[PDB]
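Replying to the earlier thread about multi-chain prediction with a worked example.

Input:
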Amino acid sequence: AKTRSSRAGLQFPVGRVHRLLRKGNYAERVGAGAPVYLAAVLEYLTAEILELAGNAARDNKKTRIIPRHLQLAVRNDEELNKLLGRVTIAQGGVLPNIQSVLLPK
Amino acid sequence: TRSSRAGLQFPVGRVHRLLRKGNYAERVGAGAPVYLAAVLEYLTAEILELAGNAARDNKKTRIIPRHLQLAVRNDEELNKLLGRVTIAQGGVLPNIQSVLLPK
Amino acid sequence: HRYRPGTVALREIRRYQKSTELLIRKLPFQRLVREIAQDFKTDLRFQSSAVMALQEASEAYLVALFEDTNLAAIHAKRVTIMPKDIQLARRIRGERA
Amino acid sequence: PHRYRPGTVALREIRRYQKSTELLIRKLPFQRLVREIAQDFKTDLRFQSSAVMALQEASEAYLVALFEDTNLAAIHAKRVTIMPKDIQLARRIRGER
Amino acid sequence: MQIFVKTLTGKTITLEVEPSDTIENVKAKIQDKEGIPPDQQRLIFAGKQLEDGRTLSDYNIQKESTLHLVLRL
Amino acid sequence: KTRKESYAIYVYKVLKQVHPDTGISSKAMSIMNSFVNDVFERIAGEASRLAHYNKRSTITSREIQTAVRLLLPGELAKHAVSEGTKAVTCYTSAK
Amino acid sequence: TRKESYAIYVYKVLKQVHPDTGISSKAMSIMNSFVNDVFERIAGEASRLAHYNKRSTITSREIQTAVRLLLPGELAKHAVSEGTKAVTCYTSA
Amino acid sequence: NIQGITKPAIRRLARRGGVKRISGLIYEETRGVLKVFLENVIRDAVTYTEHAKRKTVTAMDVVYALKRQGRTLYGFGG
Amino acid sequence: KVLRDNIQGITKPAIRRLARRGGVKRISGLIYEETRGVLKVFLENVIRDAVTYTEHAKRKTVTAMDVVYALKRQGRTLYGFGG
DNA sequence: CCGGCAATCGATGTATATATCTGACACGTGCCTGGAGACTAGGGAGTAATCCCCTTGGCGGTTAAAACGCGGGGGACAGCGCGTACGTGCGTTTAAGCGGTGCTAGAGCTGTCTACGACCAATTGAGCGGCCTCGGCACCGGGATTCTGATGGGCGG
DNA sequence: CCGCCCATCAGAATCCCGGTGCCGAGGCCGCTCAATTGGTCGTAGACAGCTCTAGCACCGCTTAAACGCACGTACGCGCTGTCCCCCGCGTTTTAACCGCCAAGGGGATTACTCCCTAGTCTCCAGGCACGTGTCAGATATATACATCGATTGCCGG
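Result:
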């Protein structure tokens, strides 16, 4: 155990997050566990979005993920939709939706 | 004092201290507090002028939050600036849709 | 005598658009606030100023919502406001998904 | 002579354009319009291609959302045609001056 | 066409000048109507200090515009 | 009884400069205090972000001017910029 | 000049979640922007929290309260669990 | 206790909003929307209170929560 | 070179395509002029902010970072063009 | 013996299967810059103890608001008719898009040196808390003015 | 001759005036702590110079998209009738609001300590720029299936 990420068992960097915290003009001092907490949270959110996007990509018989799959993943989940409410994803598109009145009878 | 040198009413030293102990940047220049104090005093004077006119309209000698609300809501620039702000004990502007009025 | 319908309504519109008082009784609002807060955490206390601020914010929110509802009702060639107008206003504003 | 009834090709186009992701505006006219607009604030300016691309993406997203709100407002008034008053109502309720 | 000059004392005065009028002429009018000497007045418009040799049309000062007067001692 | 600071005296001085015979109540004073604090925070945050973008360690009058231009709309920005420039010039001239 | 980014860590997370899919170049840019945005939001809220209570340090309590304030209902619980587990593991080792 | 928000109070709020005629089903909707708004604000305020290790909710917590939601409120110490 | 008339380059079929992506079936004939006005207002605001950002940095070229910063300032975040 | 309803059938649009190639994604290498290990010094934050202030809980009364009922007029909704504006299609015209070519303005990097901001110490006056006093504003009673709706009247189909 | 439009009355409703009182705003005094002045030092940033890159301008050719015109239909808008449901008013109930009293919990301050974080130096390895191979996906072609709208047959009035 040499790096801090290995000690915490993460994939995201702890030292880089600590450096960004210390130079972003946020507070006079930064505690030891704050980078660990922040890195864990960021890794969790990334994992959630990537899992949903990968399922969407598989639904289309595709291998690689494109911004369309990210847009489909975000817009179909309530929590992610609330979080990314005022965000525009480039080359994303829209969810297919037609009002019931316009359909033929 | 620095306000006397700049010919202002608002405090320059206090603004400088607030800038330095607010975690905004590593260093703060000499003219930034002067500029900021001047701008703040100008905005205060504008709002107070409008509110005082509103207070005089109602035959009153003291300004109350209703007068501040009337001053802010009747000016386009101030309404744009304070667009998402609620003033306590302020009220609303009188406005009735023309469709609801009797024929 | 008797006033025709719609007159006293306009009188109340004029009267309440000029005052600045609070339009909801204080004890019911206090009770509602306490029972709402008891879900997130029990054994809690409130300053009087906290309840006053809550009442002011909620009243302003409701008044603005009713203004938008009246606009939506007028758009549909009506003078009566209906729940669908509230739903349309909330949906367009962004609160309702 | 084969001919479709009104409203069929409209639904087909709705289905087509809600499934793709390309830009729906020609690039040269938009570039010219952006340069003309920017000429008011400061002359002899230059633009990266990425700047114009980002501007186009933002504009298209804004217009699409506005049209969705306009469609909702039009349906609220028991109609299928969108009209300028629907655009005005949506913009007013959204808070845009 | 008419413009408004603001002083540090909150006093706003009205001036009747022309688009082709130079800043020196505007100044001369301000002394005539207020008694303030030529050397002491500094004019600020849109964050820029005006030059006596320039005209009002040079700085795009339109009708009912406002300029801030600075006294230099 | 810990000392608590505010902007009351300066607001009253400005008011007496504008309307020589006019008072103010306590609630209006609270509202004015909140307004001044809010505008201060907005301008300071915008200037700090501007300094961060261009890789600078100092906040200068240029950052304040650009923040005022970005935040204040219309003629408010013009008049505020003129006032700030005049104040800075007067401060520099005097010593 | 060297330019740093989150690409490698995002790719490692993806290979851990879906070990067969890939990612394109624009999706990587979107993910980078997302990570930066969330980082800035949480850090700003934590700094404001520390300023309110007259403290000169940022600890894990500020981060926990920040993620409780920002993240919606069901995301917050799992995020808090992950952060607490990571901090406990770091302290133990 | 949501029924303590009586129908005449809602009518007075509507009058201040400029509404002339009111349907009979508006009061239930108004109660629901008010409850949702209060729940959000009170949740945020209680979180702010618990971070400070206090057992009393102050006006500062309410002001901070409202500012977080995007509704600044003047006149209570902001 | 100063150019005008360029708002008419946003043709009627393009606005129709945008409406189709918006889910609209029938369009009145007066929608296009108002759409042009709305687009003009939006572009004016964003471009003003971007130019302010550019001139603070003493540059003669508008970059994508300035556009992203302006859009974030107006409360419209955009993912993909850096940031 | 036609009308409405339901079952065909041709045209058309869209999804599916099969090479083909190509530009983009995934992997391999050097180095250099930032992160980790070890140690020291100091101040920020935790902990304990006091105090007194504000919040909670209970009691009595009074009176103003709320709840309930009734009668009626106006508005909401459904149905019908008309006419015009918008959708679908076709032939013609235009400019967007692609592919090169050249040129130059300007963005980005590097070295220097200097003025500007931080830090430290002593001093002193501006601003905050506490106390008083009086005048602007709230309250009550009375008169004046203003709409508003019923009543009488006049008129034209 | 009678339904529709117009002028005129009393009656609540809001407002203005005058007298009374009373509580909050404006002013004054003492102290303390934060802003001012003077001096020293280090580095952040302005300035000059050079390099190369990407943004701008011009030309030629294709062809797909835009534009103009015609025809028909289906949707929007206006009118009419009804039916019921909100509004205005009167009576009875209830509980909010005000005043008063009492107790105790917890918020705010102070003193002390210790341990967690910053700062310094050394060392080394992880991540970024660069370069290369190959395969996932876009393209072109052929084909099968679903859908829509006109045609026609059948039960029924």
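Residues 2-5, 8, 22, 57 of chain G lie near DNA strand K (CB under 10 Å from a C1').

Feel free to reuse this layout for your own posts.
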